[PDB]
Amino acid sequence: AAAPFTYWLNPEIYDAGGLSRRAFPEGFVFGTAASAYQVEGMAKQGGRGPSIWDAFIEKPGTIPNNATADVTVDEYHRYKEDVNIMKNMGFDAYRFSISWSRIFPNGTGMVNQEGVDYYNRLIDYMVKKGIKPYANLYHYDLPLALHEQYLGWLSPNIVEAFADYADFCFQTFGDRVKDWFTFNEPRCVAALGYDNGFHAPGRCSGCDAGGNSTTEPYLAAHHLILSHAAAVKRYREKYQLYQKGRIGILLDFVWYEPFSDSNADRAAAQRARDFHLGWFLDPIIHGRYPYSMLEIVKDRMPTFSDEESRMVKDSIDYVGINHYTSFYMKDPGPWNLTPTSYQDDWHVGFAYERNGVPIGAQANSYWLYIVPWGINKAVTYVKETYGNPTMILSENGMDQPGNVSITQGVHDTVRIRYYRNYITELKKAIDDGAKVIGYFAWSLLDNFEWRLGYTSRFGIVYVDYKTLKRYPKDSAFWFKNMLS
Ligand SMILES: OC[C@H]1O[C@@H](O)[C@@H](O)[C@@H](O)[C@@H]1O
After folding, report:
1. How far is CA 429 from CA 2, 24, 155, 422, in A?
2. Is 1-484 a domain of CATH 3.20.20.80?
3. How many whole angstroms from 142 Cα to the centroid of ligand 1?
């Protein structure tokens, strides 16, 4: 049992700000989201082959305090408890991811039956408890074998490797999983993996592992798009009419607000949207890359053949938008001109304040600014720009510093205000015609936050890493109250 202050009843819990299920469309889904590597543990066990993150983690100094996700919050063994918390808090759904290398230790070939069994236990238990499973197929965890064989996303070989893996998952799990995502944040897979080397496999221009920031991110993104399209084709031709599910992709989207009303600032904000979201959503909706990207990046960007363009266009039933934050965008003056990096290709200036006033308070993470109206502007933008496609707001949340006690950690009033305000702004966008059908908080549990390790807590449930005990935060109860 914890210190007395743990059990103070935060009155913010009961201020739902006017929100309930009645403020949302009939059958609107409220969920939480996690990922295999961040929550499962058993990284080197249960027959799981290693991923790129397992080798990347081995360089000392990469994770703070050289922490690993070998155990993390141990959802492999504690999945029943986690599902029960989800149910008790009133959630309808859980978006989780399947570990490619847990099913295919070598990426292709032999199946790890022990991994298959785990996901079957997990899915069977969610169905038993009335939590809808939303399965994401890839969450930063490429099997290491594939990276060793042909450098993973940088080779056209990855496309059939992935499609076959997707295919197997549909065959095996699709009798009860009716909601699929191919990828989480392919932009990040490409940009962090191959532009700045911040994420595995740590490739970039200056990087230890080698790389080329001018070409490799574009090559990676191209094969991610082809792999998504190839996977969806399997689903549609072989499973969809029989299983009656749906398939989409999850795309991160930072809102870019023009800094001023000038043509140049307004154009800069559009350019950033092109490179951030358009990069993936233009091909999926129009069968082609953003014009700006083609004119700036020229031949450093691959092109789709006519056959590819047809496979890629309309290759979703819905799009998941992951949204956290917003920045101001400036025209940065005259552009160079000589290729440097995907990020430099955007040719923009970032701004985090205007007239001495910050755009929002900062969460723990260096990148996260709390800007509730950004979620409204983002959703309206995809509605207007893309013919109002069916959307899931597939991630939203914020982090506390990792190094806080149970007692301090559970009283997360800042997160309550975060969710109340963001969900209010999302509601306004729906009232004005946006076709959103679900919302997912990141995340249920404090977990392994990639390069930040355990110095960042995103959960609505506090996890003591010493004991692995769960303590619902005030924000979990805020949801419980709002959802009934
Ligand atoms: O930063 C919080 C979260 O944001 C998205 O990238 C998620 O898909 C996770 O990978 C991550 O933990």
Report:
1. 41, 11, 40, 11
2. yes
3. 16
